[PDB]
Amino acid sequence: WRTLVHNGVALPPPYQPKGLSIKIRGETVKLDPLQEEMAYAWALKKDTPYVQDPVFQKNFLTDFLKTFNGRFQDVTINEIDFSEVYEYVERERQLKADKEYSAERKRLREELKARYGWAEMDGKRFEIANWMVEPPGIFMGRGNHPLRGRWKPRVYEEDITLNLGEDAPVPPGNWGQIVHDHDSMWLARWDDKLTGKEKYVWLSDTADIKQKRDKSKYDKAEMLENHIDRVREKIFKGLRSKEPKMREIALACYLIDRLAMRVGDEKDPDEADTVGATTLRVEHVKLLEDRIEFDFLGKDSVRWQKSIDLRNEPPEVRQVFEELLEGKKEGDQIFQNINSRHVNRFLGKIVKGLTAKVFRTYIATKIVKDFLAAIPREKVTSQEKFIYYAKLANLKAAEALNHKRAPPKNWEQSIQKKEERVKKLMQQLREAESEKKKARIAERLEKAELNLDLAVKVRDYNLATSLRNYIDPRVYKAWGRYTGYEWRKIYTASLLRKFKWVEKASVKHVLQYFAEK
Amino acid sequence: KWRTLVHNGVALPPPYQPKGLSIKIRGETVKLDPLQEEMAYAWALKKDTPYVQDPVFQKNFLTDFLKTFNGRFQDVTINEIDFSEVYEYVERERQLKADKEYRKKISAERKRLREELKARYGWAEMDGKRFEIANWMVEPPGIFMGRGNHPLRGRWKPRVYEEDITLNLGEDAPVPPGNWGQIVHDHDSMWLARWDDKLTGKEKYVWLSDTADIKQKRDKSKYDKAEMLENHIDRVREKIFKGLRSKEPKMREIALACYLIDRLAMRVGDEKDPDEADTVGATTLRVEHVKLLEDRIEFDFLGKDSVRWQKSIDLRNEPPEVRQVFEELLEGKKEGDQIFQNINSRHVNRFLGKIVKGLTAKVFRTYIATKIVKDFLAAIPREKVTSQEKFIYYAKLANLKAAEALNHKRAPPKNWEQSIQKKEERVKKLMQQLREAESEKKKARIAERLEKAELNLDLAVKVRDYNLATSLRNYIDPRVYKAWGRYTGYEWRKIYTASLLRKFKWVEKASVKHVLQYFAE
Ligand SMILES: [Cl-]
Ligand SMILES: [Cl-]
Ligand SMILES: [Cl-]
Ligand SMILES: [Cl-]
Ligand SMILES: [Cl-]
Ligand SMILES: [Cl-]
Ligand SMILES: [Cl-]
Ligand SMILES: [Cl-]
Ligand SMILES: [Cl-]
Ligand SMILES: [Cl-]
Ligand SMILES: [Cl-]
Ligand SMILES: [Cl-]
């Protein structure tokens, strides 16, 4: 770049003390501001599973107990009474759900965005992706990070170096450095004060930000594995709720869990014609004694059918379906009060960051993992067999996520052509005694035989949708490492660029699952 | 975009020469066709290695081997096969090699043909400039192996042919002789040739020597060989002892130099690189540097800047051939005489490579230094790694242990004594600035810098006599430090300068499971 101007980064607001106390072994202790700021972060997690994790507890106390001037060094979490801090949190939670409004925050939120959210690079205006420096808080990763529960210390202007053009105005701030690095694209830089990792501020719509955001989705899905039981319990509790809006939302979430059905309002053309909760009409659903049948004919003339065996489903499932169908005509929409905002608000209250898209990524990724884990390594005899199994796993995820498609236009004859190719190769090598020739015919035979079986199996399904969007590429990198074969050949050049981040990423989480025996 | 690109393609392996050998399966003599014999002979070449005792290696090998007998024997297990006839041919041919190869029958002529093939295939022209091609030989087929735990170990690597190979050439470059599978003109690609590995499915590329692709591949290869040595160090040591008992005195001297690699991590001594040229090495030892006592041997080397290096080996549990060869080399020499007069890296690496293909003095000392670092970090409780700066501190103390092990001893820095006092004052001041600290922001900013000052002071004292950079750049597998970062959660990239992060760029993609499993034990 030639010139680059921006207003730096927005630092978090200081913590506001509330005069709260805790009890340690019966002794009331008045919290200092930093003590209270940490006790408050812990309290905000009071209803999460993390505060029951002994590694999480020990890491938190490592930073917490250091603030007590030498006292309480051998205290454990069970000997601290946080109830005063919990009560403040619950009170603020109730107050936040009661102030239906003082909407002058939009002027203040918009004022920050206009001030810090835009950089001007070589005369052009560009949005900044991450201009807010996050406030201090408790560190968390995907579930097994060794530093989980440790405090992330507050970052100040002096820790931050800004990248600016030489003729740009130095924005207000006690910055630690202003560098004129025409070579590098980043806007601001600083070291994370817990992990030692370098933190960068990038323009929106850049390679670094999209790779980060792409990987973050699959990371949330991996984390979901730790919480899926609780999610399912809260979906069913929602179905039993007294509030009809809650029952309807919970039922849409039940359909995500059970059928991997999308919400129905996403506009992306890859899935816009597939079934979704909001496009279900009364005529698409039949409630029977032992099952619920779904039968949906889409715009593309694709008929999608699945059923749910009610034998071992909770009774509240049929109860809410009956409630929503009651009194409606066959052409009426079933889910008339649903959209992605309501669904993701419900899910997000169970697991922060959880959305329907993350949920379906977890589903598709688990299906692929479980399919491949069931294959004895001795059956994976070649690169072609490796690809074949990878694709059958992709197909299982496609059918699970309802990525049904109209058959390829000339599928009928192309199968005979693959059947012809198999036939012709079949005895082409039967009349060739040279083993160098009888070997390079054997190789294309199995490639053709596997490619034929695959071509029959994939006719009605678009595998690309889940391969591009819902299957964690770490599963296929791990499958490559587990078996020895070339997993990059599962992907187009385009998807290899999209998943460039997988090259550096650990696959221990998946590979340990394959290697269990 | 290159504009023109000219080369002669790649050199294909020589065809296998059948020998008319047979094996026995369940007592039935079976005559081997060419491919079966080729595979049986490869297996026989490993008859005295651990690999042929590994059930995974066996199953993989039998998967491809039994496939050659298309109807019969599809049920056979490895113990039902009698390879003794192939074993005998191998032993006969290797005993035959115990007479003359480094003579003129296989010296000048072997040399001449080697240079002839290099002149034919080793050079490309790109945009009118001539460049050496790094890997113009297609490797012959054989039994696949990785670093020790590869899932395809024991599988056959099938022969590659001209018809399998794509060449990348300018549109109007001459088409080199050969039945190439395809000629492309891809101005966006720097590779010269490409084919699929017929076992692993990985795409194989031919590159110019001056590429990142080759530099990175050669850098990682050294550390991979050192990782693989971990499984074989006992056998290597026994073959060193065996060399010490050889009847040829030149092999005995070479063996003793290799023994000093193993026991003291002592370099050969002939490498010109200034990083190590002033440290002790086998070829730099003189009679007065070595005291042979009754149950131990003491080394006392006085080098540049009056730096004295001293280490000793306890001999009482050592095999007597160690003392034997030392006495042999010391006898008839007086003060000032060089002990190892027929030693260089070529002879040493020839000897080591006969034990393990690709093994060299540098690979051996990389294994030593890497194990030292791994063992040091593995013994550290996670509770002690309390911060990024503590993490870096322990990493450097491990680095120092490898420096001491590999004899990278140096004279203390010019102003060390005063550069130690100055840090003692800066910590003294830093503590008083933190007692009078006020705001939380201030109490933490000084705490940050104080902890850094105290650790750096203790480091500065401990590293006075050793150059840590040599082993960090050359002998410590960076996967150890990446794994240390993953085990603890801290940023391992700060262990490295920008230069070393470039050299070790390959570690970003590399698995560290082999080391991390050891830390997580
Ligand atoms: Cl932001
Ligand atoms: Cl975590
Ligand atoms: Cl979690
Ligand atoms: Cl600040
Ligand atoms: Cl949707
Ligand atoms: Cl809700
Ligand atoms: Cl890989
Ligand atoms: Cl090769
Ligand atoms: Cl291996
Ligand atoms: Cl040397
Ligand atoms: Cl690797
Ligand atoms: Cl791995």
Numbering used by the authors:
A (entry chain B): 4 to 104, 109 to 524
B (entry chain A): 3 to 523
Please quote the paper that reports this structure:
We solved the crystal structure of both selenomethionine-labelled (SeMet) CsTOP1 and native CsTOP1 at 2.0 and 2.20 Å, respectively. In the asymmetric unit, each TOP1 molecule folds similarly, and there is no significant difference between SeMet CsTOP1 and native CsTOP1. In its apo-form, CsTOP1 folds as a compact protein, comprised of the CAP region (1–207), the CAT region (208–412), the linker (413–469), and the C-terminal region (469–524). The Lip2 loop segment moves towards this region and partially covers it. More precisely, the side chain of glutamate Glu278 (Lip2) forms hydrogen bonds with the Nε atom of His410 and the hydroxyl group of Tyr477. Therefore, while the DNA cavity is not blocked by the presence of the CAP domain in the CsTOP1 open-conformation, the Lip2 loop interaction with the catalytic tetrad may hinder the entry of the DNA molecule, and its displacement seems necessary for DNA binding.
Type IB topoisomerases (Topo IB) are found in all eukaryotes (where they are referred to as TOP1), in several archaeal phyla, several bacterial genera and several groups of viruses. TOP1, also known as swivelase or untwisting enzyme, can relax both positive and negative supercoils by nicking DNA, enabling the rotation of the broken DNA strand around the complementary intact strand of the DNA duplex and catalyzing the closing of the nick.
